[PDB]
Design a protein around this ligand. Structure first.
Ligand SMILES: *[C@@H]1O[C@H](CO)[C@@H](O[C@@H]2O[C@H](CO)[C@@H](O)[C@H](O)[C@H]2NC(C)=O)[C@H](O)[C@H]1NC(C)=O
Ligand SMILES: *[C@@H]1O[C@H](CO)[C@@H](O[C@@H]2O[C@H](CO)[C@@H](O)[C@H](O)[C@H]2NC(C)=O)[C@H](O)[C@H]1NC(C)=O
Ligand SMILES: *[C@@H]1O[C@H](CO)[C@@H](O[C@@H]2O[C@H](CO)[C@@H](O)[C@H](O)[C@H]2NC(C)=O)[C@H](O)[C@H]1NC(C)=O
Ligand SMILES: [Mg+2]
Lengths: 505, 47, 96, 215, 337, 107
């Protein structure tokens, strides 16, 4: 398996067959597979040295690992996108031995002195072919020379088998399994051979080869493979239940933000709810966790304007729940990234000198922003895409809050709707679903560069189309949902989480 | 193949034939019920 | 029911043999892949090279005794086969 | 106490062994143990030394058998450092074998023989596969007399019986005994012992097991 | 195995002993120890065809003799038929009830349905001369290229001392056709060559078959000299050019050894001084450099390329035409595969 | 103590080669357990030297320093046969014994 280490030094050689035995539609699937793979690799934050070679009768070298441009994912993607099937269509042979000799020359050092870090370096080879080497000698003997060059199998104390991993993609309608099985590396309970049907369900393909050794705890990293369950797709999702006499049973949602802390809404709970009467279950486990203390925001007050004449006031509807014991991150347990952090900086693939202001502008441009939230339907998590009304319809989104029962007599709309509120819902430009009352406290999720950033927390909705387990009938056109902006309470969170080592800018 | 028999390629051979296995060590630390600890170990069989 | 086969080993070492079987009209199949030793012709021999008595006071004189042991000639050795040298020493109690 | 993973090994294979170190009260003690492995005639080939303190009285060790080896009985011998004269031992066997697919048990009706029994010694054969199914085949059984280390074989007591329903039956008659021995005196036979050797082969001709009942 | 020096100092006395343990080549070892086993397979004569039984029929006869000082006691005969052959039931009933002879009922009542492996028990076998028996066999499966049969003999007290014989109507004694170059032996159980008949001689089709991975090299050669041996002979060929670069380099073009089994000299003898067009696969060449030898096998293809003066016959005109087009075609355009 | 090994599954159909199954091990709390699984065919080839709990107690009984199932020839012999030494201020004392083994066993 390929290891993802940020402190790593890794060479990835991409070899793509171009013989007439492939076909155009199959060649395109080969490229589309590589584009998703390189994108997912850069989304994890590892920058390897890419080598790109297309071969038929004669290999054609596009990117050399010695070049500094080989570590540029977008530049390599541009080189890959430029590659055409009919570039050398008239030389559509299959001389695989020469293609491996070109890769062998790339990792080869001049003279007899390897540069320091040669054994420190990881090497990965990805081959796509029809398994029909028809010209030239045997290609397998060059693999042994590559195994030779990397000093593999040369020491009982240090095998170095994991410094070389060979994956082979069986492409084209006609394919030879025998030669393909010989080329690929052979390791216990690890798949290195993939077929034509594997071009569908790409996330599952990468799930077999990717090893998240040094990237277990990274925020906003999701497994989207078909076999995955709800929490494979939402590692941060947390379900909080409070059962207390008179109040009765109640459940809200939360999002993992640190080792001990979960972020959720404030109006779901109260100070009178005792810590022993509050149960929290994090995604991937059904065991209810014991909590230590709940940190309500200081400026929170549900009855802030109760004496003035307004029934309910939802300003500063955020709260942090501290677990008694620390979580251990995994494939189904990971926090969601927070703005203006070193994780978000690396997630957006920005240089480390990028400021918090620049990231705010990128997250919140003066337009309608695409977003999504998570909701439950028959105990199953599902995604609902919505638009954040930050553009010209931002004023209309705030005005529609008055049609909620209990706020008819408010004169000033800017008074009740505080800058903490983020506004979603409605039918313009497209119909946005409305949250259930159980969906409150969940995160507001934005997708950028194959990663997920949290931008808000679900508060309340104008029209409760999801009154109790039923979301019947289409929604009113003025039905809006409101969310607490993270930038307003960002200083307070930075104050609380200064010891949590999240890399705030 | 279209006939009512398994093709050869998808027939996978049993090959793990060690004489002795399960050479492991474990400590009884499970909750003692009547002083007797009940340990559960899920083990891979051989071929 | 037993189905015999006849084969010839072609190269030395712990070589592998694999057979497969599948039944008709049911999708029940089985395959067996086992290995057996391909041994070059010959048999193990435990021959003796040399046996001598040690006595530095009486033999060799002046408290020191030294002598060489030539390596075994083994002209009947099978090409590219293992060969171990077993050395054993045991003292003589000189206390009556 | 010395434990091994198997009772009999192949050349070129690994030997795993664990030593349990207890005091005179059978509780785990932490002391240094001296271990030696000897060949069939008593030549030490490999030796170990380790302390069981903080290991809860368990010393797991291992050793590889070369292909160049003398088959026979091999013994692991151990003694504490503070008591070198008190030596414990356990044995294992080295042979070139193949695993059988069935077991052969030879059961006399009585685990003894009465000399003047007219019917003679009845021995029931029981055979079954290792996975629990009944064996069908043919067996060849032979009898003999054991006196100390001296074994006398009766050539004409040989019988050939098929194994049916996973079982067989063979009887060594008194006449065969009196004919087998040249001694018409029955008093000299008292105190001696008999032994049975059975050779069973399946009707497929692909396997064979030799079993022995003695004493 | 190494020599060393021993040095002892001080009062006292001891004993030095050095033993070497190694693999020694067998000297006059008898594989069929204590057994002289002979097995003969022959087709049934004209007495069998007389009642118009109209089927494939052969007779298997077995004879053996013990080598010990006295007659050996009870022994077992394990017999394996050639594939698709079932022994005649009526012959085994006659043999089974004979004295010193027995066949189990469970084995006996099987008949043609599953009797492929046969077990015959003999209470004793004479040591002075051969004891024999025979029975008929019939083919009922109708498959060509049958597996050779085998008969193994051993006793109830010792399977270690045993003997095994094979039989096959076309392989003489049923032995495998392995090829040996002194100490280095490799198998040679193959057809001698592919496609030397060529009733419909193509060119376009042959180019497509030259572009498949099964063909690793295509050589134009000229036979220099043949060197005889026992059960094989080697053909000294001069490589003129590599039409397709194979597992080895051209090396300017020098003599490369080709070897044919004795059973393939009967199929087709190559003639010296003549040119030949050849192609094969990577498994054909044998040994290690510089002692590589190319074995003629079922994957090898050879056809004569006439010399210039030989090309003038009107039919060999077109052969030298087409063999020349294949020459220029492969080198310049390669394969679209 | 008490160590018992059984299957984790209730029963179910006989296991499949290579299939995952649950092994249940019952024993006193705080004890260390070692495991070994062997094919029964190996013991059909050689059943010698198999260690068991009864053979452990057999070595203990063979290591006993007592040589008599109780009683004795007199009051002095009672303790010396059991494996004890007795000594008083008055003068009565055990018989002197300087041998570890028991003289000529009956067998
Ligand atoms: C890879 O190429 C093969 C053929 O080169 C494609 O096979 C096609 O399958 C459809 C099935 O409906 C046929 O109708 C076509 O005639 C086939 N050949 C074509 C389209 O050239 C196969 O679909 C290709 N794989 C992918 C993923 O596109
Ligand atoms: C690359 O090469 C060396 C060997 O030349 C590798 O081996 C290490 O060598 C250093 C110093 O000799 C030791 O301290 C390490 O323990 C060795 N590593 C092992 C045995 O795994 C080493 O991997 C590399 N050396 C570097 C990076 O300095
Ligand atoms: C040395 O070679 C002999 C060859 O037989 C091995 O077997 C011994 O053979 C003698 C016969 O001369 C028997 O008396 C012994 O009983 C055999 N040994 C055993 C252990 O039974 C022998 O094992 C080889 N090795 C040694 C160290 O003697
Ligand atoms: Mg191709």
């Amino acid at each position: 398996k390929i290891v993802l280490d940020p402190s790593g030094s890794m060479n990835i050689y991409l070899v793509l067959d171009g013989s007439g035995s492939i076909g155009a539609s199959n060649f395109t699937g080969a490229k589309k597979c590589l584009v998703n793979l390189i994108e997912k690799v850069a989304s994890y934050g590892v920058k390897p040295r890419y080598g790109l070679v297309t071969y038929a009768t004669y290999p054609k070298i596009w990117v050399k690992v010695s070049e500094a441009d080989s570590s540029n994912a977008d530049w390599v993607t541009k080189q890959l996108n430029e590659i055409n099937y009919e570039d050398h269509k008239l030389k559509s042979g299959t001389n695989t031995k020469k293609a491996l000799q070109a890769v062998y020359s790339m990792m080869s050092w001049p003279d007899d002195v390897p540069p320091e870090g040669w054994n420190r370096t990881r090497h990965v080879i990805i081959l796509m072919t029809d398994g029909l080497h028809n010209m030239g000698g045997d290609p397998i003997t060059v693999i042994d020379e590559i195994r030779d060059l990397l000093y593999i199998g040369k020491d009982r104390k240090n095998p170095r088998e994991d410094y070389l991993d060979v994956y082979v993609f069986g492409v084209g309608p006609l394919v030879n399994q025998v030669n393909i099985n010989a080329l690929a590396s052979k390791k216990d309970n690890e798949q290195h051979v993939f077929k034509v049907k594997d071009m569908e369900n790409l996330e599952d393909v990468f799930y077999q080869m990717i090893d998240e050794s040094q990237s277990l705890s990274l925020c906003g990293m999701v497994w989207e493979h078909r076999k995955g369950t709800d929490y494979h797709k939402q590692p941060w999702q947390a379900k909080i239940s409070v059962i207390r006499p008179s109040k009765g049973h109640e459940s809200c949602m939360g999002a993992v933000v640190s080792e001990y802390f979960v972020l959720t809404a404030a109006h779901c709970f109260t100070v009178d709810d005792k810590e022993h009467s509050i149960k929290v279950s994090v995604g991937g486990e059904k065991r209810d966790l014991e909590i230590e203390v709940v940190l309500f925001h200081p400026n929170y007050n549900i009855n802030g304007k109760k004496e003035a004449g307004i029934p309910e006031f939802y300003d500063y509807d955020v709260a942090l729940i501290k677990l008694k014991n620390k979580l251990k991150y995994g494939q189904t347990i990971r926090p969601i990234c927070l703005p203006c952090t070193e994780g978000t900086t690396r997630a957006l693939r920005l240089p480390p000198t990028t400021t918090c202001q620049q990231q705010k502008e990128e997250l919140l441009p003066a337009q309608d922003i695409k977003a999504l939230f998570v909701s439950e339907e028959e105990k199953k998590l599902t995604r609902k895409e919505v638009y954040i009304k930050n553009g010209d319809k931002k004023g209309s989104c705030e005005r529609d809050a008055q049609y909620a029962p209990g706020y008819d007599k408010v004169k000033d709309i800017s008074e009740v709707v505080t800058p903490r509120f983020l506004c979603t819902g409605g039918v313009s430009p497209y119909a946005d679903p409305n949250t259930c009352r159980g969906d409150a406290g969940g995160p507001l999720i934005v997708h950028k560069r194959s990663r997920f950033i949290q931008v808000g927390v679900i508060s309340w909705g104008v029209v409760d189309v999801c009154k109790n387990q039923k979301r019947q009938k289409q929604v009113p056109a003025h039905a809006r949902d409101f969310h607490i902006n993270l930038f307003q309470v960002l200083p307070w969170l930075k104050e609380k989480l200064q010891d949590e080592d999240l890399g705030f800018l | 193949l279209d006939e009512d028999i398994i093709a050869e390629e998808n027939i996978v051979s049993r090959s793990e034939f060690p004489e002795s296995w399960l050479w492991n060590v474990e400590d009884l630390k499970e909750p003692p019920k009547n002083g007797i600890s009940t340990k559960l170990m899920n083990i891979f069989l051989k071929d | 029911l037993s189905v015999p086969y006849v084969i010839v080993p072609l190269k030395t070492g712990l070589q592998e043999v694999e057979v497969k079987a599948a039944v008709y009209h049911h999708f029940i199949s089985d395959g067996v892949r086992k290995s057996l030793k391909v041994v070059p012709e010959g048999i193990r021999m435990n021959k003796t090279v040399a046996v001598r008595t040690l006595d530095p006071e009486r033999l060799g004189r002046e408290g020191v005794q030294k002598e060489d042991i030539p390596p075994a000639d083994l002209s009947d050795q099978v090409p590219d086969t293992e060969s171990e040298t077993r050395i054993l020493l045991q003292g003589t109690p000189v206390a009556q | 106490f010395i434990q091994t993973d198997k009772t009999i090994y192949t050349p070129g294979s690994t030997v795993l062994y664990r030593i349990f170190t207890v005091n005179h009260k059978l509780l785990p003690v932490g002391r240094t143990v001296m271990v030696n492995i000897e060949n069939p005639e008593g030549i030490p080939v490999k030796q170990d030394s380790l302390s069981s303190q903080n290991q809860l009285g368990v010393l797991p060790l291992s050793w590889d058998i070369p292909e160049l080896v003398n088959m026979g009985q091999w013994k692991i011998r151990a003694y504490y450092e503070n008591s070198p004269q008190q030596v414990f031992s356990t044995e294992f066997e080295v042979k070139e074998y193949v695993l059988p697919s069935f077991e052969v048990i030879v059961e006399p009706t009585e685990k003894f023989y009465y000399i003047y029994n007219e019917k003679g010694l009845e021995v029931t054969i029981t055979a079954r596969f290792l996975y629990g199914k009944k064996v069908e085949g043919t067996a060849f059984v032979i009898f003999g007399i054991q006196d100390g280390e001296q074994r006398i074989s009766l050539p004409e007591s040989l019988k050939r019986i098929p194994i049916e329903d996973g079982s067989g039956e063979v009887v060594l008659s008194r006449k065969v005994l009196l004919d087998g021995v040249q001694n018409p005196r029955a008093e000299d036979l008292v105190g001696k012992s008999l032994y049975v050797s059975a050779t069973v082969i399946l009707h497929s001709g692909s396997d064979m097991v030799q079993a022995e009942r003695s004493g | 195995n190494e020599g060393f020096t021993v040095t002892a100092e001080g009062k006292g006395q001891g004993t030095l002993s050095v033993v070497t343990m190694y693999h020694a080549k067998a000297k006059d070892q008898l594989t069929c120890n204590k057994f002289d086993l002979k097995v003969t397979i022959k087709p049934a004569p004209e007495t069998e065809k007389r009642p118009q039984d109209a089927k494939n029929t052969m007779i298997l006869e077995i004879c053996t003799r013990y080598r010990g000082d006295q007659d050996a006691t009870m022994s077992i005969l394990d017999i394996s038929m050639m594939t698709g052959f079932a022994p005649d039931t009526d012959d085994l009933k006659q043999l089974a009830n004979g004295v010193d002879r027995y066949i189990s009922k469970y084995e006996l009542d099987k008949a043609f349905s599953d009797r492929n492996t046969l077990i015959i028990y003999l209470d004793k076998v004479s040591h002075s001369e051969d004891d024999c028996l025979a029975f008929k066999v019939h083919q009922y499966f109708n498959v060509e290229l049958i597996q050779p049969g085998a008969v193994k003999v051993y006793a109830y007290y010792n399977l270690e001392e045993s003997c095994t014989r094979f039989y096959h109507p076309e392989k003489e004694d049923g032995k495998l056709n392995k090829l040996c170059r002194d100490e280095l032996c490799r198998c040679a159980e193959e057809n001698c060559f592919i496609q030397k008949s060529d009733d419909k001689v193509t060119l376009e089709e042959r180019l497509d078959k030259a572009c498949e991975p099964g063909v690793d090299y295509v050589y134009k050669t000229r036979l220099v000299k043949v060197q005889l041996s026992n059960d094989f002979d080697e053909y000294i060929m001069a490589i003129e050019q590599t039409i397709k670069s194979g597992s080895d380099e051209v090396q300017v073009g020098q003599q490369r050894t080709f070897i044919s089994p004795i059973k393939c000299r009967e199929a087709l003898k190559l003639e010296e001084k003549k040119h030949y067009l050849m192609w094969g696969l990577s498994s054909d060449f044998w040994g290690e450099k510089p002692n590589l030898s190319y074995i003629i096998g079922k994957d090898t293809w050879v056809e004569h390329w006439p010399e210039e003066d030989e090309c003038q016959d009107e039919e060999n005109q077109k052969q030298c035409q087409d063999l020349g087009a294949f020459t220029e075609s492969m080198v310049v355009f390669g394969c679209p595969n | 103590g008490s160590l018992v090994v059984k299957s984790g599954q209730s029963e179910d159909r006989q296991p499949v080669p290579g299939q995952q199954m649950t092994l249940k091990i019952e024993g006193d709390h705080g004890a260390r357990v070692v495991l070994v699984a062997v094919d029964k065919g190996v013991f059909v080839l050689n059943k010698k030297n198999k260690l068991t709990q009864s053979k452990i107690w057999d070595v203990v009984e063979k290591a006993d320093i007592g040589c008599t199932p109780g009683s004795g020839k007199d009051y002095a012999g009672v303790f010396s046969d059991a494996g004890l030494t007795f000594t008083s201020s008055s003068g009565q004392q055990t018989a002197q014994r300087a041998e570890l083994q028991c003289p000529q066993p009956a067998a």
